[PDB]
């Protein structure tokens, strides 16, 4: 779900950036309410995420080549030998059905090599399950002697916003998703709107990203009146302030001049102490899934020489306790923890 | 001293506008804890019917299966609940889905080409190019296919765009619509927006008559501040119409001559429906859920 | 891609108002603001939903591996 | 009166890709040192 920025420099159109949207316009409230948002952590609305807000997909392509001059491995299934329930993922040709759900261990293709006289399969292996988007058979680098050996398989990996995923405004204010807060528990505006994203007010005094502050009252003004605003640098002056410009626009529409909104608590239901700073800010979802190195090991495999847990997250590997952690365990005088 | 009968004496309801989709009603002399409870229930706890299990047979469209399945779930169905029983999750799929627990909606669209003189319109250039919510055909099955005879399953908003196609592409699916609550997923929330706003209070400390009264009148929306004459003071005609912009406080001539507060007891509720139930039915069920929640705890053994 | 079903913030159905919005801008020759008002979008959250929609699906559809040329 | 976004213009161009000169010349002007550099390898004066 790509969206055109309300607040934008006019050069965005000059480069036709609308052909490739990079973000979405979100209702962002500068509020410290949940308690889970603080400095590097921001809150995303549950009901917003449930409605497809910031949803993304990731496509991965694999090349299954049979080269390792006489042809031995052939795409498909060998006669007489056939291990149980493989036909659920692959078609008669040995290639997978485009659209099929696959998990690590599932067969991604099938072939038969005469050297071993057995029907083998190339397994799909990744922590993230996928669906087959595209299967292309390529039989090139031959004049008359044609036979397929090379196949390109595209995987569609669905990626909903998870706790840990980074999100950022166009002002360098990145933060990890601390929690997907429910709309009932979310603070609700006088208008009846609950913010899509919650940014903590303690982020701004150190970063000094005032561009985001003016973007908030500009985005709100442009959403109400239905007009895009120019946010090209040095357009405004010390005499002609944007906070006054969009402030006048906000007052004319029927909202508070200083970009504030009277909000009520989602828990107690009572009106909050003061009016909360709410607006429309163009937010970007960063591609990284930070919890990629998430692992747990009780008793996994060990190296033959050292008889110590082997290195490798996916291999059920061990976490290294290095010299500094050794030093720290000596430090506490905690000899049994070191042991 | 607070009695439940003493509450009946002061508690008032005022209906401003009651449309087929949205109802604007007031809850006078009630606590925040009760008004917020109904609000929370109307969004999260009032059960509704929405597509949950989309079974795809073919999808050659540009829109991915996951995305297309999610869009069908988001489409509100003009289905009254209570007609459906709650599905049990522990027993298997063959026992799980029945004529009392599930509603089936099928989508079978194939795009082709049409001869027309050529910018040219997609409805002219291609046949079945745009897939709408109205294209979800209701299929009644089992023991009861006569209970939904005078009540056909149709999406609340039919003109909702579900998919866009080009000749050669096709969509074939069987969607299983079930009963769920808004707390689980936003697709099950029967309300578009159930929110309350406290009655704005404008405490005029000084008479502020004259030309300053005309200046004070422009600080609030048109139908809020009313002036009798040049004198006879400056009164508040309809404090309910106020937007609470605090525009009056950003002026030196009024910053100390007026106070802006609220009526903590008075709540202005605005409830819009997705299309399945009427906004009154949604509020009534919310009060019925709060009562049932307190009733379930009343007739319950206090363990340990 | 296509117009989202329901407003991300509140949940007001917006998916049935995309084609109707372009008709209010083309045939009726109205401004962006007045067009959204006639569709029944008064909250700025519902306002930006359609106003800010790109509709890349029309660009995406022009690549069809099922029909020649 | 404003520095608005092209909505009607955008959607029409999405359906109708121009048959004349491509829109956004600055985008082609961005890759001008790359294409131009390789163009001068065969085309231009002195062969």
């Amino acid at each position: 779900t790509g969206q055109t920025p309300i607040v934008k420099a006019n050069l965005y159109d000059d480069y036709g950036m609308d052909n490739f949207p990079n973000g979405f316009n979100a209702v962002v409230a500068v509020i410290s309410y949940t308690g889970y948002d603080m400095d590097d952590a921001m809150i995303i609305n549950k009901s917003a995420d449930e409605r497809g807000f910031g949803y993304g997909t990731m496509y991965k392509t694999e090349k299954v080549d049979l080269a390792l001059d006489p042809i031995t491995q052939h795409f498909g299934f060998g006669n007489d030998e056939w291990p149980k329930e493989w036909l659920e993922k692959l078609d008669e040709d040995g290639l997978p059905y485009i659209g099929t759900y696959v998990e690590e261990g599932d067969p991604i293709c099938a072939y038969f090599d005469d050297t071993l006289n057995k029907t083998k399969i190339k397994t799909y292996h990744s922590s993230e399950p996928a669906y087959i988007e595209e299967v292309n058979l390529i039989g090139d680098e031959s004049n008359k002697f044609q036979e397929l050996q090379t196949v390109s398989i595209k995987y569609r990996i669905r990626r909903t916003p998870q706790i840990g995923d980074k999100f950022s405004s166009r002002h360098g204010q990145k933060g990890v998703c601390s929690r997907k807060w429910p709309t009932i528990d979310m603070p609700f505006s006088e208008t009846g709107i609950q913010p899509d994203i919650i940014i903590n007010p303690h982020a701004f005094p150190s970063r000094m990203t005032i561009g985001m502050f003016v973007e908030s009252l500009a985005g709100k003004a442009g959403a109400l009146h239905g007009i895009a605003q120019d946010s090209t640098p040095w357009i405004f002056n010390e005499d002609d302030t944007p906070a006054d410009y969009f402030g006048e626009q906000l007052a004319k529409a029927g909202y508070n001049y200083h970009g504030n909104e009277p909000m009520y608590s989602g828990a107690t239901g009572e009106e909050l102490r003061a009016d909360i700073y709410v607006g429309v800010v163009y937010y970007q979802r960063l591609r990284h899934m930070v919890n990629d190195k998430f692992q747990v090991r009780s008793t996994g495999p060990v190296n033959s020489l050292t008889m110590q847990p082997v290195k490798g997250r996916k291999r059920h590997g061990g976490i290294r306790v290095g010299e500094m952690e050794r030093d720290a365990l000596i430090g506490h005088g905690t000899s049994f923890l070191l042991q | 001293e607070w009695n439940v009968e003493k509450f009946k004496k002061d508690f008032e309801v005022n209906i401003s506008s009651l449309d087929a989709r949205e109802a604007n009603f007031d809850l006078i002399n009630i606590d925040t804890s009760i008004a917020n409870a109904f609000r929370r229930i109307m969004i999260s706890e009032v059960p509704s019917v929405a597509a949950e299990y989309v079974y795809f047979f073919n999808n050659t469209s540009v829109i991915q299966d996951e995305v297309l399945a999610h869009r069908i779930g988001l489409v509100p169905l003009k289905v009254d609940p209570d007609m459906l029983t709650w599905v049990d999750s522990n027993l298997p799929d063959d026992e799980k889905f029945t004529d009392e627990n599930t509603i089936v909606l099928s989508l079978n669209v194939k795009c082709t080409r049409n001869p027309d003189a050529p910018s040219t319109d997609p409805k002219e250039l291609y046949n079945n190019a745009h897939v709408y919510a109205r294209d979800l055909k209701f299929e009644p099955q089992g023991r009861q296919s006569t209970t939904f005879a005078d009540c056909p399953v149709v999406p609340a908003d039919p003109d909702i765009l579900l998919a866009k196609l080009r000749p050669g592409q096709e969509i074939s699916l069987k969607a299983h619509c079930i009963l769920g609550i808004g707390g689980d997923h936003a697709k099950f929330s029967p309300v578009s927006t159930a929110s309350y706003r406290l009655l704005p209070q404008i405490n005029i400390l000084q008479p502020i008559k004259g030309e300053s009264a005309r200046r004070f009148q422009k600080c609030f929306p048109p139908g809020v501040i009313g002036i009798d004459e040049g004198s006879d003071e400056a009164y508040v005609k309809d404090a309910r119409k106020d937007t609470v912009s605090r525009e009056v406080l950003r002026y030196e001539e009024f910053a100390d001559k007026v106070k802006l507060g609220r009526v903590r007891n008075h709540f202005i509720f605005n409830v819009e429906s997705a299309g399945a139930m009427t906004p009154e039915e949604i509020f009534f069920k919310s009060v019925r859920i709060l009562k049932n929640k307190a009733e379930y705890l009343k007739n319950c053994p206090i363990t340990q | 891609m296509i117009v989202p079903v329901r407003c991300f913030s509140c949940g007001k159905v917006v998916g049935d108002k995309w084609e109707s919005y372009l008709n209010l801008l083309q045939e009726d020759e109205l401004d962006e603001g007045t067009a959204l008002s006639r569709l029944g979008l008064k909250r700025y959250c519902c306002r930006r939903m359609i106003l800010t929609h790109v509709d890349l699906i029309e660009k995406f559809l022009r690549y069809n591996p099922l029909e020649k040329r | 009166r404003t520095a608005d976004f092209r909505t009607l213009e955008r959607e029409s161009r999405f359906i109708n890709p121009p048959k004349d000169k491509s829109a956004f010349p600055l985008l082609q002007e961005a890759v001008q040192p790359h294409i131009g550099s390789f163009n001068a390898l065969t085309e231009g004066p002195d062969g």
């Binding site: 405004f236 529409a253 | 937007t243 | 700025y44 | -």
Partner: peptide, 24 residues
Amino acid sequence: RKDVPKVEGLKLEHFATGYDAEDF
């Protein structure tokens, strides 16, 4: 230096919950 041009004919487009654009 020329000031940023203000937008032509900006009206009220936000009111109370149960109140429409009836008041002009």
